[PDB]
Structures are given as C-alpha cells and as structure tokens.
Design an enzyme around this catalytic site. Structure first.
Site, PDB file in Angstrom:
ATOM      1  N   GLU A 124       0.872  -1.222   0.000  1.00 45.20           N
ATOM      2  CA  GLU A 124       0.000   0.000   0.000  1.00 45.20           C
ATOM      3  C   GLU A 124       0.910   1.277   0.000  1.00 45.20           C
ATOM      4  O   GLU A 124       1.851   1.362   0.826  1.00 45.20           O
ATOM      5  CB  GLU A 124      -0.922   0.040   1.257  1.00 45.20           C
ATOM      6  N   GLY A 265       3.186   2.515  11.141  1.00 41.27           N
ATOM      7  CA  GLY A 265       2.905   1.631  12.326  1.00 41.27           C
ATOM      8  C   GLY A 265       2.695   0.166  11.892  1.00 41.27           C
ATOM      9  O   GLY A 265       3.290  -0.755  12.466  1.00 41.27           O
ATOM     10  N   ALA A 266       1.801  -0.052  10.926  1.00 43.72           N
ATOM     11  CA  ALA A 266       1.489  -1.438  10.475  1.00 43.72           C
ATOM     12  C   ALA A 266       0.662  -1.419   9.183  1.00 43.72           C
ATOM     13  O   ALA A 266       0.504  -0.358   8.587  1.00 43.72           O
ATOM     14  CB  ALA A 266       0.751  -2.151  11.559  1.00 43.72           C
ATOM     15  N   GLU A 268      -2.587  -3.755   6.956  1.00 53.06           N
ATOM     16  CA  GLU A 268      -3.663  -4.757   7.085  1.00 53.06           C
ATOM     17  C   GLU A 268      -3.743  -5.830   5.950  1.00 53.06           C
ATOM     18  O   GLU A 268      -4.848  -6.284   5.561  1.00 53.06           O
ATOM     19  CB  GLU A 268      -5.008  -4.084   7.197  1.00 53.06           C
ATOM     20  N   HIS A 301      -6.519  -1.284  15.156  1.00 55.49           N
ATOM     21  CA  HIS A 301      -6.739  -0.634  13.868  1.00 55.49           C
ATOM     22  C   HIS A 301      -6.584  -1.619  12.666  1.00 55.49           C
ATOM     23  O   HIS A 301      -7.443  -1.641  11.737  1.00 55.49           O
ATOM     24  CB  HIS A 301      -5.687   0.433  13.714  1.00 55.49           C
ATOM     25  N   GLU A 302      -5.499  -2.379  12.653  1.00 62.09           N
ATOM     26  CA  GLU A 302      -5.349  -3.371  11.561  1.00 62.09           C
ATOM     27  C   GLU A 302      -6.429  -4.465  11.553  1.00 62.09           C
ATOM     28  O   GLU A 302      -6.851  -4.883  10.439  1.00 62.09           O
ATOM     29  CB  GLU A 302      -3.948  -4.018  11.528  1.00 62.09           C
ATOM     30  N   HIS A 305      -9.629  -3.021   9.999  1.00 64.31           N
ATOM     31  CA  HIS A 305      -9.554  -2.871   8.549  1.00 64.31           C
ATOM     32  C   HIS A 305     -10.110  -4.145   7.909  1.00 64.31           C
ATOM     33  O   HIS A 305     -10.523  -4.142   6.793  1.00 64.31           O
ATOM     34  CB  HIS A 305      -8.102  -2.702   8.093  1.00 64.31           C
ATOM     35  N   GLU A 324      -9.717   4.803   5.974  1.00 64.67           N
ATOM     36  CA  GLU A 324      -8.827   5.180   7.102  1.00 64.67           C
ATOM     37  C   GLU A 324      -9.566   5.952   8.174  1.00 64.67           C
ATOM     38  O   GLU A 324      -9.318   5.761   9.349  1.00 64.67           O
ATOM     39  CB  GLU A 324      -7.621   5.989   6.649  1.00 64.67           C
TER      40      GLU A 324
HETATM   41  N1  LIG Z   1       1.836   5.717   4.382  1.00 65.22           N
HETATM   42  C1  LIG Z   1       2.196   5.086   3.316  1.00 65.22           C
HETATM   43  N2  LIG Z   1       2.858   5.752   2.314  1.00 65.22           N
HETATM   44  N3  LIG Z   1       1.899   3.775   3.176  1.00 65.22           N
HETATM   45  C2  LIG Z   1       0.966   3.085   3.959  1.00 65.22           C
HETATM   46  C3  LIG Z   1       1.312   2.013   4.788  1.00 65.22           C
HETATM   47  C4  LIG Z   1       0.378   1.341   5.596  1.00 65.22           C
HETATM   48  C5  LIG Z   1      -0.974   1.716   5.550  1.00 65.22           C
HETATM   49  C6  LIG Z   1      -2.051   1.030   6.338  1.00 65.22           C
HETATM   50  N4  LIG Z   1      -3.396   1.037   5.743  1.00 65.22           N
HETATM   51  P1  LIG Z   1      -2.307   1.933   7.872  1.00 65.22           P
HETATM   52  O1  LIG Z   1      -3.612   2.918   7.833  1.00 65.22           O
HETATM   53  O2  LIG Z   1      -0.898   2.678   8.240  1.00 65.22           O
HETATM   54  O3  LIG Z   1      -2.681   0.933   8.891  1.00 65.22           O
HETATM   55  C7  LIG Z   1      -1.324   2.759   4.711  1.00 65.22           C
HETATM   56  C8  LIG Z   1      -0.390   3.419   3.897  1.00 65.22           C
HETATM   57 ZN   LIG Z   2      -5.322   2.157   8.329  1.00 63.61          ZN
END
Ligand SMILES: N=C(N)Nc1ccc([C@H](N)P(=O)(O)O)cc1
Ligand SMILES: [Zn+2]
Ligand SMILES: [Mg+2]
Ligand SMILES: [Mg+2]
Ligand SMILES: [Mg+2]
Length: 889
Positions: A124, A265-266, A268, A301-302, A305, A324
């Site tokens: 992602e 952080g993580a 999904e 959170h994960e 999702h 999000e």
């Molecule tokens: N922030 C980025 N460029 N990449 C990125 C990495 C992880 C995620 C997950 N959906 P998150 O909302 O961080 O749990 C979303 C985007």
């Molecule tokens: Zn997220």
C-alpha cells in the site's frame, strides 16, 4: 509530474482475473515469475495495454506463451510497460513475465525488502508494482496463487495470504511453500514474509458461528517473549467488533508479524498483518508505558480494517478516508472501551487540535477527500485519518448508538464484497437518520460538505438569560476562513452536544441534548431554566472546530471544578491558559520590541491556581486528568492563535506561567509525587505479562509530570528523588530520571547508566535515543553529534533516525535557535535520508509545516533551507512534490 484528479475516475479497459506468482529468493537477487489471466473489459476502446512496473529488470515478457520484442511490440521506461495494442488479444489471454528485483538493497521499505534477516513486502499504496507488473490500482480485483522459495536454514518460515496448500523440498538446501487465496482482493493487500520467525499462538472461537480461528503472532527469535500483549490485544479487538458491531472474522487464521524496519505503524494485508516492531512488541522490563496503549491501538486498527478496508473495499484512492477515517473511528471507540480512562478521548482531541489543525491552516490544507494528488504515498495524512475519524464519529453523535449501529450495519450488509465511495457511507447513515427523525424527507446532503470542504470551522457563542421568564438563549455562529480550495466556504452540519450547569450546586439542568447547527447562525432557546446556567459546550468534543466559548475565567473555573464532561473541563482549563498565554506573550513582545528597561507581567489568575490545587488534592479525581491540568497547551496548538510567532517570546511566556503556578503549588506537587509512589509503582503484577492497568500507568504519568515540574523549578533537594527514580524497574520512570536530570550535574552519569540498561533491546534503545533527543540541555547540539558518532552512525532504520531527530525539533528554544542552525541540521538529515527513503525524508519535514506562521526572521531561515533542499539535483519525486506544495511555489 502527472496530476491525478478525482473527477477523472474511469474503470480500466482490462480485467485481471487470476495471478499466479513464483517468488524465488536468492542471496543476491529475487526472481519473480508472474502469470496474469486477463480479459478485455466492456470499457475497452482498443487502447495499448499499460502495466505499472517500477525498478524492474525484465528477463522476458510474453502473451499466451509467446515472447514479446522490446522496441517493436513494447517499451518499458522503468515506470510503465506499454504493449502496443496491435499485439494485445481481444479475448481471455495470459500475460507472463520474469523480472529480477533486489530486496537486500531496497532501503525505501516499499515493494519487497529485507529488514534485518526477514524478507517482507509493503504494497500500500503503490508498492506491488515494485515486485511485478500490474494495473496497480485498488479496483483491479483478482485471485492469487502464490509460491515462495528460499534457502531453508535462512528462511524456514514462509507466509503469504490464504491457505498454505503445499510445502516442498528443493535441491541445494532450498524449500518452497504454495499459498492459494481464492477470494478476490486488490493487489495492495498482497503480502509475503520469509524468515527465521518464532511465534506465540492461541485459538479464538467466534461469537455467533462458533468458528475456530487460529491466531499467530511472529517476531525474530530474540524478541519472541515480547509478543504476549499483542496476542491479548488481537483477542480484545475480535471481541469488540463482535460485541459492538456484531461482526465476526471470516477466515480460519490471522497472522501478525513484527519487523524492525517499517515506514509507519502497520499494514492490514489480508490474514497477514505486518507491523513496525515498536507497535507490536512490549515487555514490562524493556518498554515504556506508552507502548501498551500503542500496541492495543495499532493491533486494533489493523483488525478493524478487515471489514473497513478489506471486505468493503475502495473504488479509487480518493476515497481513502472511507477506510482510514472510519477505521481510526473504530480504533478509537475500541481504545476508549478497553482503557476505561477519560484521558484516551482527551489524547485524541489533543492530537487533532495540535497536529491536524496546524496542517489545516498550512499551505498543505486539504479536505478529507481531496480533488487531486501527485504522490499517493504523501496522501496518508492526519487530515485524512484524524479529521476523517472525527467526521465518522459525528455520525455516531448525531444518530446515537442504536441508530448509528443500524446505519453502520446497512453500509456493511449492502457493500460487503464490493467497492464503495464516501457517498455510499453517507447514504447508509442517511437511512438511519430518516428512521431516527421518523421522517423520510430528512436528509444528510449538507453532511457531504465535511468531505469536500477544507479548513477548520470556527464556532462562537453569545448568551442571554431572562430571570423573570426563566428563558435562556444560546446564539451560535460558524465561519470557515477561505483558502486555496474554496473561495466561499459554505455552512456545515455541526452537532453541538451541550449541557447546562447550575453554578450554585454544579448540577445538570437539562437532559442530553445535541444542537444541530445547519446555518451560518442560529439561536437555541430553553424554557423553564430556573437560574442563569453555565453552558457546557461541545461535550466529548462533538465537532472538529475551533471553539470560542466567550466565557469568563470564573465560569471556566466553575466548569473545570463542577462539569460532568471530561473534555469540557479540560477545554475550560485550556481556554484559561490560552487567555493567559496570549496576554503574557504580548507583554513580553512589547518589551522586546520597545527595548524596555522595565515593564509589568499580568500574573496567573489566583482562583484558577486555587482550582488546580483543589483538583490535585482530591483523592477521588483521576490521575491522568490531573496530568493534563498541570501542563500548558502544546506549542503546536498555541501557534494557531498567534501571528508571526516569536518562539523565544513564547518560551519566556511559558516559563513565566509555569513559575507563577509552581511558586504557589510546588509543595503540593511534592507531597503528591511522594504519596502516589506506592500505587503508581506497585510491582504486584510486573511478571504477569497480560495484566495491563491503564489507571496505574496514568498514575505514573502524573508522577513523571510532577517530577519534571519540580526539577525545572529546582525544588529543594529534588535530585535525591531523581536519583532514587533512576533505580525504578519501570522504563517510564528511569528514562524520566534521565530527562529531568538535565537541570543537574548528574545528567551524564544518568545518561551512561540508562544507556547501559537500554543498549541490548533494539526498541528500548530507540526510547533512550528519544529521551536524549528531547532532553532540555544547553549542550543539546553537542549531544546530538555524540549520538550520531556513537549510536546512530549510518543506520538506515527509520525508527533510529526518527528517534534521534524528531523529539529535538520540539525543543522550542533550541531547535528554533535564531542562527538557523537547527533548521540547517534537520534539512541535512532530510536530504541524506531522501537518497534511500523518500517517504521517511518527507516525514522528517514535519517541523517545517508551520514555517509561514513564525516571526519574519525565522520564516526566512526555514524557507532558505527548504529552497536549498528543493535545489538538490538528486531530490526524489515525493520529497519534491511535498516541498513544492509546502512553500507555495
Ligand atoms: N503511508 C504510506 N505511504 N503507506 C501506507 C502504509 C500502511 C498503511 C495502512 N493502511 P495503515 O492505515 O498505516 O494501517 C497505509 C499506507
Ligand atoms: Zn489504516
Ligand atoms: Mg530494480
Ligand atoms: Mg466475547
Ligand atoms: Mg538495528
């Protein structure tokens, strides 16, 4: 660079039905073979077939098992593979390719990469095209059949999405595993992991279908003992989605995996969630308290999702807030219910009004659903996440819990298995709104303005009371400042949760009431109000607005003492401090400007000091709440209220106000620091890995806050307390001992002691680096150079770089040194980092977001550094686009 526009969305002229992957990981390279089973869609118009593919080395490409010829049948420019349409078939066909990629040198941490001795993917938003060719956009749904092979001694544990259907030996010490994942998904939810991973596991039984779900949590061997809290959080998360939303997990297994090198952080990925180790691992011995809430929140959170992102999916990336913002809302409801402390909600408000309000008044301001982007990787913002979460939470406030649940369940039932847009969500909430109003003509059309309009609304109040009539009026006004996205801002649908407090006995005077402000102004009248009330406005922080309560400090004090709502009490305190700060700031500024030989400062309100002592002395009041009331509002909140802010004048203002209060209350602070010790530091459950007590941690927070106040004040003999505190078994305590010792000659002795305690746990060492970075030291520049030479060196781990530099940028006096040397230092670090990790280099720009809000000298110093960075010949596309938007170029 290409600008993508929301209004330009059109479905692809192709379909990819099936992906079959072979990923063969070798010492110096990884070879990826991919067969795509494709079709021509109803939208097709004879166009070239164009795949995304970034940084790939083509061995060969084919259609239907025949090789294509570069130059004649196709071009590849390291970003897009174009296969000229005359060679593209017109029914179901196979595209195949074999590419080489290099996870070992992939330091950008996107695509397939090596973190220490683990190979791991992050797809992602645009990382899947760094692994193999694809139409890499979230509406391209496909089935995945994935085989991974690797050296078996180096990579014994092979994971990808779906069921593991085969395991096999390969000559030369290698082995393979095949994973088949028949349900459709977008490619950004693909993941693979290979490593010498150790695990903890449990079986969870779902609430309604009684399905057994196996839960695995994985890390490298050295840290396997830090996985237990994460497993407890995952159970908690599954139970909450069951209990609050009636939603069960659909799959037979869920894996969580910790890696050391991660940009956020993580993530999904379906059935295979991957985490930054700092958001998955903790122990009582080797983590500060903050790690416990952080893990609960990111595991939650994960998990959430899986519905709000993985089962109800996005049509296109402009809808990002629908997964999000909604997931952060679900995460926050879960954290509030699990911690049971009022400071959980307060900490979310604190975050929004410091960091997101700053963004929303910066050149980077955008609505939660933007109209364009250039870089998808820069689209994941506090606005999309945290203001998106407050917009999702306002539906709950407007509807109440029973109707909110019905609306949410409408959205899930109708869109499960399909892509959705922000309108579909608003539609489902509207159906619940019609049912609640019991009138089918009620609508939420004006609500969609929360998706499209940028900027923070301002909401202000005037009041009237007629004693003879027993009639009270609240006059409300809303305004949003014009900006680069809307010239004319329209009135929003603003829910205002209110109470009316009798100032004579502190009692509620009306039932639960939420005013629905839908016009630029309105007047709300209440009859049979026996005495003139103090209004309790925006209870729970009911809309993401600047609240201008126009109350006197006497009224604010009365709320702070007597109101039932934690956020209004805290906001009343905040408003008293802001009035004080702006008055003293202007007195300091006038003295500096006029070079006065003498001048007066307005002292802190005596009755406000008395109210603080009254709260602190109350043994039944909450310790977390107490820590908030003794702390001034954050600098990044204050800046929203001052033009051309001189950071040195603000530092002097804050110093004066803290010394005024401490001059009255230090004895009280000391007495509480001592009496809180037995319960705050109780070791009864230190060896119980699953026993987490959020109230006890809030007591520690309070003691650590009081100790910091007593140390800055140089309270008599406080060093004795600091030294004793350094011997505590809790890292929250002994790292605090390090930062408060900055005001004494003991600082380097405690620096060495705490380093020794931290150095053999990677994550604890990072917390030590943060503690050092944030230390209130006059020789902070020389200390940073020391950390660079001795500890950080040329680490490319984003957790190390961020730990060393970001906390320092909050040092108001020193980061903002008038020579510009702090801005120079951080700009050098951004430029160095950008060579290998543009995403983290962009994160490290955060202190610059407020550049045009500071005094003219500092605006110019920051703008100089930003222009220097923009001029680097080797600047990344991502860093460039961001700095261009920030400097209004
Ligand atoms: N922030 C980025 N460029 N990449 C990125 C990495 C992880 C995620 C997950 N959906 P998150 O909302 O961080 O749990 C979303 C985007
Ligand atoms: Zn997220
Ligand atoms: Mg490459
Ligand atoms: Mg249960
Ligand atoms: Mg390391």
């Amino acid at each position: 660079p290409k600008i993508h526009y929301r209004k330009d969305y059109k479905p692809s002229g192709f379909i990819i039905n099936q992906v079959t992957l072979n990923i063969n990981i070798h010492d110096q390279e990884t070879i990826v073979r991919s067969v795509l089973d494709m079709d021509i869609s109803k939208h097709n118009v004879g166009e070239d077939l164009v795949f995304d593919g970034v940084g790939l080395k083509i061995n060969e490409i084919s259609i239907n098992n025949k090789k294509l010829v570069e130059g004649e049948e196709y071009t590849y420019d390291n970003e897009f593979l174009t296969i000229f349409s005359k060679f593209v078939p017109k029914s179901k066909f196979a595209f195949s390719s074999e590419v080489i990629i290099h996870p070992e040198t992939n330091y950008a941490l996107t695509g397939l990469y090596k973190s220490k001795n683990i190979i791991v993917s992050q797809c992602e938003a645009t990382g899947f095209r760094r692994i193999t060719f694809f139409i890499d956009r979230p509406d391209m749904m496909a089935k995945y059949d994935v085989t991974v092979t690797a050296d078996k001694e180096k990579y014994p544990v092979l994971l990808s999405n779906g069921d593991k259907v085969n395991e096999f030996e390969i000559p030369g010490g290698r082995h393979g595993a095949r994973f088949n994942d028949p349900p459709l998904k977008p490619c950004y939810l693909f993941a693979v992991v290979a490593g010498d991973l150790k695990h903890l596991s449990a079986t969870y039984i779902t609430k309604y279908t009684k399905k057994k779900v196996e839960l695995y949590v994985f890390s490298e061997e050295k840290y396997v003992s830090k996985l237990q809290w994460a497993l407890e959080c995952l159970k908690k998360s599954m139970a909450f989605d069951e209990d609050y939303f009636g939603l069960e997990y659909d799959l037979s297994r869920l894996n969580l995996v910790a890696v050391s090198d991660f940009n956020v952080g993580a993530m999904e990925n379906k059935g295979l969630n991957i985490f930054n180790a700092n958001s998955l691992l903790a122990s009582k011995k080797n983590s500060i308290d903050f790690s416990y809430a952080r893990i609960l929140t990111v595991v939650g959170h994960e998990y959430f999702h899986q519905y709000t992102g993985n089962r109800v999916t996005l049509r296109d990336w402009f809808q990002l807030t629908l997964k999000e913002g909604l997931t952060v809302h679900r995460e926050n409801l879960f954290s509030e219910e699990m911690t049971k402390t009022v400071t959980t909600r307060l900490s979310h408000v604190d975050l929004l009004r410091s960091v997101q309000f700053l963004e929303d008044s910066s050149p980077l301001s955008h609505p939660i659903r933007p109209e364009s982007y250039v870089s998808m990787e820069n689209f994941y913002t506090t606005t999309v996440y945290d203001k998106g979460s407050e917009v999702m939470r306002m539906y709950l406030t407007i509807l109440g819990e029973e109707y909110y649940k019905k609306g949410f369940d409408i959205y899930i039932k109708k869109n499960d298995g399909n892509t959705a847009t922000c309108e579909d969500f608003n539609y489902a909430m509207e159906q619940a709104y019609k049912m609640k109003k019991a009138d089918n003509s009620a609508n939420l059309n004006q609500y969609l303005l929360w998706f499209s309009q940028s900027g923070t609304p301002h909401v202000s109040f005037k009041y009237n009371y007629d004693a003879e009539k027993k009639q009270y009026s609240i006059h409300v006004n809303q305004y949003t400042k014009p900006d680069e996205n809307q010239k004319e801002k329209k009135p929003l649908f603003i829910p205002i949760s209110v109470g009316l407090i009798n100032p004579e006995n502190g009692k509620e005077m009306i039932s639960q009431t939420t005013l629905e402000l839908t016009k630029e102004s309105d007047t709300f009248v209440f009859n049979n109000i026996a005495v003139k009330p103090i209004p309790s406005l925006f209870r729970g922080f009911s809309a993401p607005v600047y609240i201008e309560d126009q109350l006197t400090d006497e009224e604010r004090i009365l709320l702070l003492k007597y109101d039932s709502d934690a956020f209004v009490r805290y906001n009343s305190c905040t408003n008293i401090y802001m009035k004080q700060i702006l008055m003293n700031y202007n007195e300091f500024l006038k003295a500096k400007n006029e070079k006065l030989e003498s001048f007066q400062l307005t002292p802190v309100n005596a009755q406000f000091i008395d109210a603080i002592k009254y709260l602190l002395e109350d043994p039944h009041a909450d310790a977390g709440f107490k820590s908030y009331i003794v702390s001034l509002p954050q600098d990044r909140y204050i800046i929203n209220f001052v033009s051309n802010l001189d950071t040195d004048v603000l530092a002097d203002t804050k110093e004066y106000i803290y010394k005024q209060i401490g001059d009255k209350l230090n004895d009280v602070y000391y007495k509480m620091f001592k009496s809180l010790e037995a319960k705050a530091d109780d070791l009864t459950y230190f060896n119980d890995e699953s026993h987490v007590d959020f109230d006890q941690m809030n007591m520690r927070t309070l003691r650590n806050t009081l100790l910091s106040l007593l140390s800055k004040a140089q309270y008599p003999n406080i060093l004795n307390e600091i030294i004793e505190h350094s011997k505590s078994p809790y890292p929250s305590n002994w790292l605090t001992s390090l930062s408060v010792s900055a005001y004494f000659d003991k600082y380097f002795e405690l620096y060495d002691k705490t380093y020794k305690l931290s150095k053999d746990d990677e994550l604890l060492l990072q917390e030590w680096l943060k503690t050092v970075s944030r230390s209130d030291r006059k020789d902070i520049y020389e200390i940073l150079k020391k950390l660079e030479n001795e500890v950080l060196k040329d680490s490319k781990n984003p957790n190390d770089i961020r730990a060393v530099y970001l906390p320092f940028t909050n040092n108001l006096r020193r980061f903002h040194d008038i020579s510009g040397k702090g801005y120079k230092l951080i700009a050098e670090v951004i430029t160095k980092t950008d060579k290998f990790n543009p995403m983290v280099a962009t994160q490290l720009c955060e202190p610059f977001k407020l550049w045009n809000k500071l005094d003219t000298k500092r605006q110019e110093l920051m703008l100089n550094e930003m222009n220097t960075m923009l001029q680097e010949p080797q600047i990344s596309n991502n860093l460039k686009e961001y700095l261009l938007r920030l400097t209004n170029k």
